[PDB]
C-alpha cells in the first residue's frame, strides 16, 4: 500500500509513504513518511579502492536523494580494481574482483 519514493541503492535509503485510515470516523488520517537506512560501519570512502580510510560521517541530504560519492555496494554492478603483480624483475597489472561472490559468470 506504499510507494517507494526514493530507492537509492548506493545509499540504501528506502523512503516509502502510506495512508493509514482511522476507522468509522471522519478523516484524521496520519501520513507515514517511513525511512530505512543500513549503514556499513566498515566500508571506506572509496567504495571500490581499498587503500582509503574508513568513512564515519553518513551525510544524507535527502533533498539530493529526492531529486558523486556513495557508500553502499550494489549487487548487479560489478566493481574492479587493478593491482601490480611481480614475478621477478618484470611486473604485470591484472584487474581483480572486489565482489566475486556475484561477479563470476552465471
Amino acid at each position: 500500500e506504499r510507494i517507494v519514493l526514493v530507492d537509492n541503492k548506493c545509499k540504501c535509503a528506502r523512503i516509502t509513504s502510506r495512508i493509514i485510515r482511522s476507522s468509522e470516523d471522519p478523516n484524521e488520517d496520519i501520513v507515514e513518511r517511513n525511512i530505512r537506512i543500513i549503514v556499513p560501519l566498515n566500508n571506506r570512502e572509496n567504495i571500490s579502492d581499498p587503500t582509503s580510510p574508513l568513512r564515519t560521517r553518513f551525510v544524507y541530504h535527502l533533498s539530493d536523494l529526492c531529486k558523486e560519492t556513495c557508500y553502499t555496494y550494489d549487487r548487479n554492478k560489478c566493481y574492479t580494481a587493478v593491482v601490480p603483480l611481480v614475478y621477478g624483475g618484470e611486473t604485470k597489472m591484472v584487474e581483480t574482483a572486489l565482489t566475486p561472490d556475484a561477479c563470476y559468470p552465471d
Partner: protein, 232 residues
Amino acid sequence: IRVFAIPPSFASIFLTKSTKLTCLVTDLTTYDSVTISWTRQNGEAVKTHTNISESHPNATFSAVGEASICEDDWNSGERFTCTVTHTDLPSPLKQTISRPKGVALHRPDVYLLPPAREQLNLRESATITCLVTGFSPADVFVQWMQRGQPLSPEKYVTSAPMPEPQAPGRYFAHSILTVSEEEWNTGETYTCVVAHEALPNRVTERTVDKSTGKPTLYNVSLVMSDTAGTCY
C-alpha cells in the same frame, strides 16, 4: 643425487605467458654432456639446454630445459616425460609430468586474520596471516603488497597446500608477515592477493587495517539532515 620435476606454474602462464617447464637433477657430478630428451609420445625434443646452471657452491650439477606446448594440449593430459642423457647415469631415469584429466577446480575463499591482541601488548613485531581455504589442488602463488607497493618476498613465508581435514578434496594454505609494532600502530593497511583458477580474472584481493583489525571503537557520526524535504 636429488631428482625433482616441476610442472609449469599457474602464475607463470598467467603472468609471463611463456610455458617454461623442466625436470631438475642436483647434487651430482658435472659432466656437461646432458641433453634431456622429452617424449610427447614421440622421441623428438624441441629445445636443448640453454642458460644451464652448472655453477654450484658444492661444484654439483643442474639441468635446465625449456619448451612451448599448447594450453589445450596440457588440458588434454598427455603423458609428457623427460629422459636424462647424462653420461654418468648408466640407466636413464624416467620422470613424467602430466596433470590428470578431471581434477577438482574451485575458487580460493581468502580470509585475512588480524593479529592477536596479546602480541601487540607485548610490544614487539606483530604477525598477520592470510588464510586460503578450499582452493583447487593446483599450487597457488600468493604475495603481499602494502598500499599498492609490492613488498619483497624475503620476509613472508608460505606453507605448502595440505588436504583439508573436513573435505577430502579441497585444500588450504597459509602465509604470515612479520611487521614492526609501530607500523601496525600507525594504521597502515595491508593487502593479500591470490592467483588461482575458477575466478572471473583469477586474482582476488582483501585488506584490513588497524581501524578494521578487530577494533574497540565504532566512531559513527550519523548526521541525517533535511528529513522533511519534498518528494513525489
